[PDB]
Amino acid sequence: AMETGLIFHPYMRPGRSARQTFDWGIKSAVQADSVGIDSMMISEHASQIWENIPNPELLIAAAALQTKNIKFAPMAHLLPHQHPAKLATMIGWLSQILEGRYFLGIGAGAYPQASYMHGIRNAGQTKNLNDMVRESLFIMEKIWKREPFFHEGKYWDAGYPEELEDEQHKLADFSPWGGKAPEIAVTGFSYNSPSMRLAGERNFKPVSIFSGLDALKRHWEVYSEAAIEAGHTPDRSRHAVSHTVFCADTDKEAKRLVMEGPIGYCFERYLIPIWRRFGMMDGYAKDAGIDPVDADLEFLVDNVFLVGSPDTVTEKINALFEATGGWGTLQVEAHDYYDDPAPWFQSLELISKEVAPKILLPKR
Amino acid sequence: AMETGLIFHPYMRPGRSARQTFDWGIKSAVQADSVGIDSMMISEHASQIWENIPNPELLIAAAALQTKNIKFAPMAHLLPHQHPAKLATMIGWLSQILEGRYFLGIGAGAYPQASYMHGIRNAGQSEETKNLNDMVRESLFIMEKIWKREPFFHEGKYWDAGYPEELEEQHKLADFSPWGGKAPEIAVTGFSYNSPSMRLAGERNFKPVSIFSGLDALKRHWEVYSEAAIEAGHTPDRSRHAVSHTVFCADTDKEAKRLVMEGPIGYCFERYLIPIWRRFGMMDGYAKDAGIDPVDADLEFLVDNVFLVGSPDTVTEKINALFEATGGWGTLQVEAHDYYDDPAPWFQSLELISKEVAPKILLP
Numbered sequence: 001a002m003e004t005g006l007i008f009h010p011y012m013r014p015g016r017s018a019r020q021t022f023d024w025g026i027k028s029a030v031q032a033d034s035v036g037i038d039s040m041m042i043s044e045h046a047s048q049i050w051e052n053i054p055n056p057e058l059l060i061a062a063a064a065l066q067t068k069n070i071k072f073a074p075m076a077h078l079l080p081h082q083h084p085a086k087l088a089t090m091i092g093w094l095s096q097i098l099e100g101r102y103f104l105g106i107g108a109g110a111y112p113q114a115s116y117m118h119g120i121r122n123a124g125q126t127k128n129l130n131d132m133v134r135e136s137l138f139i140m141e142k143i144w145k146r147e148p149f150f151h152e153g154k155y156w157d158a159g160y161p162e163e164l165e166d167e168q169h170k171l172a173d174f175s176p177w178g179g180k181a182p183e184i185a186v187t188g189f190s191y192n193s194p195s196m197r198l199a200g201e202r203n204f205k206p207v208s209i210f211s212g213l214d215a216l217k218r219h220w221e222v223y224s225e226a227a228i229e230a231g232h233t234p235d236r237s238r239h240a241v242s243h244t245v246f247c248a249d250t251d252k253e254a255k256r257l258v259m260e261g262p263i264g265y266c267f268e269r270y271l272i273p274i275w276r277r278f279g280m281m282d283g284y285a286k287d288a289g290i291d292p293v294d295a296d297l298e299f300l301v302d303n304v305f306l307v308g309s310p311d312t313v314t315e316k317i318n319a320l321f322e323a324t325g326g327w328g329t330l331q332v333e334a335h336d337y338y339d340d341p342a343p344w345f346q347s348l349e350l351i352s353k354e355v356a357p358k359i360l361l362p363k364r
Numbered sequence: 365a366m367e368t369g370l371i372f373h374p375y376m377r378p379g380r381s382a383r384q385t386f387d388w389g390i391k392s393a394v395q396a397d398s399v400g401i402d403s404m405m406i407s408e409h410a411s412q413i414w415e416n417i418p419n420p421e422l423l424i425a426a427a428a429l430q431t432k433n434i435k436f437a438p439m440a441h442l443l444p445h446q447h448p449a450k451l452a453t454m455i456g457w458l459s460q461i462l463e464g465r466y467f468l469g470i471g472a473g474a475y476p477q478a479s480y481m482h483g484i485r486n487a488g489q490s491e492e493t494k495n496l497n498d499m500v501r502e503s504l505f506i507m508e509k510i511w512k513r514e515p516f517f518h519e520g521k522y523w524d525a526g527y528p529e530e531l532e533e534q535h536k537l538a539d540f541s542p543w544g545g546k547a548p549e550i551a552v553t554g555f556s557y558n559s560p561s562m563r564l565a566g567e568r569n570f571k572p573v574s575i576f577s578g579l580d581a582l583k584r585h586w587e588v589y590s591e592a593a594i595e596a597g598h599t600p601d602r603s604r605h606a607v608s609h610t611v612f613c614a615d616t617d618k619e620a621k622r623l624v625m626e627g628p629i630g631y632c633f634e635r636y637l638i639p640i641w642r643r644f645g646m647m648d649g650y651a652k653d654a655g656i657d658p659v660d661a662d663l664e665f666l667v668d669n670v671f672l673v674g675s676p677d678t679v680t681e682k683i684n685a686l687f688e689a690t691g692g693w694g695t696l697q698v699e700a701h702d703y704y705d706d707p708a709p710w711f712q713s714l715e716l717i718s719k720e721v722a723p724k725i726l727l728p
C-alpha cells in the first residue's frame with residue numbers, strides 16, 4: 001500500500017561540482033526506478049550551497065528517457081521567480097516527454113536571498129510572495145487549458161492566443177499529458193501550516209516534512225478539514241511524508257553507517273545547527289521528553305530517524321501509523337553517497353522491497 | 365579548418381510526440397559528437413508545430429553527460445519571455461554542467477503568437493507598448509551583472525532583479541556563475557540583407573550566425589558586422605562566423621539529390637518552408653544569384669542551385685566556390701531535418717560532411 005519515494009535536495013557536500021551533482025542525480029533516479037521507488041522529488045534553490053539545484057527540470061529531463069516507471073516532481077518550482085507562461089509551457093512539455101510520470105510542486109520560496117535575486121525585496125517581512133503564487137497558478141491553469149485570454153496582472157502579463165486566420169499552422173500543444181493540469185503538490189512544515197490549508201482547499205497533494213507526532217496529525221487535520229469544506233474527498237494515500245531513513249542488515253550496522261557516514265556528516269556540519277537556530281527540533285524534543293539543547297546526532301538516530309533493520313524500520317513506521325494515522329508515500333531524504341553508493345543503494349532497495357509492503361493501511 | 369555544426373529547430377513532422385522529438389534530439393547530439401561535429405544549436409519556440417522545442421535547455425541538459433566534445437547553444441533564448449535572474453542562474457549552472465561546452469544565443473522572438481503568451485501585445489508593430497529589443501537589452505544588462513556576482517538591485521522597465529550581499533563556507537551564497545566565472549560567449553542570428561542583429565553583434569563582439577539567403581546578404585552581413593566591430597575596437601574574426609545551410613551528402617550526386625527530393629528534407633520544404641519563403645520573399649537572394657524569377661523557385665531549383673547537396677567532392681566544390689565569392693566562414697551550421705524514422709542515410713551524410721568535406725575547405 002505505502003509507496004517509497006526519494007526527495008533530492010540534494011545535500012551535496014560543499015565543493016562538489018555541478019557535473020558531479022547532476023551525475024549523482026541521474027544515477028539516483030536510475031537506481032530508484034530500478035528498485036521500484038514510486039517518485040523522485042527534486043528541490044529548487046538558487047542561493048544555497050548544500051541544496052545546489054536551481055533547475056530541477058534539467059535533472060528530470062536528463063533522467064526521463066533513462067527510467068521506466070518512476071514519477072518525477074519539482075519540489076518545488078518557486079512561482080514568484082519565473083514568468084508563468086514560460087513555466088507553464090515547460091511543465092506541459094516535460095509532462096509530455098515523461099508520458100505523465102510527472103507531478104508539480106509549487107512554492108513561494110523560503111530563502112530571502114533568492115527572493116531578492118528575482119526582484120522581491122523583504123520576502124521575510126511591496127510584493128507578497130503568496131499573492132504571486134496565486135496569480136501564477138491562475139495564469140498557468142488557463143494556459144494548460146489552451147483557452148484563449150490575455151491577463152494584465154499585478155505581477156505579470158500573460159495570455160494564450162486565438163488561432164490565426166493544414167494542421168501545421170495551428171498552435172503548438174504544450175498542455176500537460178492528457179491535456180489537463182498536472183497533479184499539484186505543496187510542502188508544509190510548521191504546526192498550523194497555511195500550505196496544508198491551501199492544499200486542502202485546492203485538492204493538492206500534501207507533502208509534510210516530519211517534525212513530530214503533533215504536527216503530522218495537525219497537518220492532516222488542517223488538510224482534510226479544508227478539503228471537506230471545499231467539497232473534496234481527503235485521501236490519505238496522497239499524503240507524502242519526508243523522513244531521514246536508512247536500512248541495513250542489523251540495527252547496529254544501520255546506526256554505525258548513519259553515525260559515521262554521509263548522513264551523520266551532513267547533520268553535524270550543516271543541518272543540526274540550522275535546526276537548532278530555527279527551533280526545528282522542538283517537536284522531536286517534546287515527543288522524546290528532552291530539552292532541544294540536548295538534541296544531538298545520536299539522539300536523532302535513536303529517536304527520530306527511521307533507522308535500523310528492515311524489521312526495526314517496519315516497526316517504527318507502523319508505530320507512527322498508529323500514532324498519527326499514517327501516509328501514502330514515505331519520502332526518503334537523499335544524502336551525498338556519490339563517493340560510495342553501495343550501502344545507500346542497498347538501504348533504498350531494502351526500504352522499497354522489504355519494509356514498505358509490510359506497512360499498515362493509513363486512516364481513512 | 366572550417367568546423368561542422370548542427371542547428372536543430374527541429375523541423376519535426378506534425379504529429380511527432382514530445383518524447384519522440386526529445387529522443388531524436390538526444391540521438392542527434394550523441395551522433396554529432398561521435399563524428400566530430402563542433403557545435404549543436406537548438407532553437408526555442410512556444411507557438412510552432414514544426415519548431416517544437418520550447419525549452420532547448422532541457423535537451424542540452426539531457427545530452428550533456430552523454431557527449432564528450434560537442435558544444436551546445438540555445439539559438440536562441442528569447443529574453444523577453446523569462447525573468448532574467450532565473451535565466452541567468454540556469455545558464456550559469458548548465459554552463460558548469462557542460463564544463464564550458466556551451467555558448468548562448470539571445471533573441472527577441474519573431475512569432476507574435478508566442479510574444480502574446482508572454483504578455484507582449486503587438487510584437488509585429490514598431491497605454492504605452494513594450495519593445496522586444498529594449499527587453500533584450502534590459503535582460504542582458506541584468507544577466508551580466510548576476511554572472512559577476514557583485515551585489516546590486518535593479519528596478520527596470522520590464523523586471524526587478526538583483527544580487528544580494530552575503531548575510532551578516534556552507535552559509536555563503538551559491539555560485540551559479542558560468543564556467544570560469546565569466547559570461548558565456550553570446551551569439552545572435554541574422555537573416556535580412558541589412559541585419560540589425562549583425563550590427564549589434566559587431567558592436568558587442570558577439571558571435572554572428574547568418575542564415576544563408578544568398579551571396580549578397582552573406583557578404584553584407586560580414587561587412588556590417590566587421591565595420592561595427594572595428595568601430596567598437598574589436599578585431600573581427602571570420603572563424604567565429606557561423607552560416608546556416610541545408611546540406612546533404614551521399615556517395616553520388618544522383619543519390620544525394622534523390623534522397624533530398626524524395627525524403628524528409630524535400631517533404632519539409634514542399635509542405636512547409638517553400639510557401640513561407642515565397643510569402644515573405646525569402647527566395648529573392650537565391651533568385652537573383654541564379655537569374656530566375658522568385659515565382660519559379662521550387663524544390664528542385666533549391667536542390668540544384670542553393671542547397672549544399674551532392675557527393676563529398678561536389679559539396680566540397682560548392683562550399684569552396686562560396687568561400688571565393690563571399691570570403692567564407694568558420695562553421696557550416698547544418699540544418700537538421702526529421703530523419704527519426706530513417707536515421708542511417710542522414711547520419712551517413714553528417715559523417716561525410718564532418719569527416720570528408722569540412723577538412724578540405726580553404727581558409728576564410
Ligand SMILES: O=S(=O)(O)CCN1CCN(CCS(=O)(=O)O)CC1
Binds near residue numbers: 209
Ligand atoms: O537562510 S535563511 O536564514 O535566509 C532562511 C533559512 N530558513 C530556515 C528554515 N527553513 C525551513 C524549511 S521548512 O522545513 O520549514 O520547509 C527555511 C529556510
Ligand SMILES: O=S(=O)(O)CCN1CCN(CCS(=O)(=O)O)CC1
Binds near residue numbers: 474476553554640
Ligand atoms: O508566423 S508568423 O506569421 O506569426 C511570423 C512569420 N515569420 C516569417 C519569417 N520567419 C523567418 C525567420 S528568419 O529566417 O528570418 O530568422 C520568422 C517568422
Ligand SMILES: [Cl-]
Binds near residue numbers: 043051
Ligand atoms: Cl529546503
Ligand SMILES: [Cl-]
Binds near residue numbers: 203231232233234
Ligand atoms: Cl475529491
Ligand SMILES: [Cl-]
Binds near residue numbers: 407
Ligand atoms: Cl525560426
Ligand SMILES: [Cl-]
Binds near residue numbers: 597598599
Ligand atoms: Cl578582439
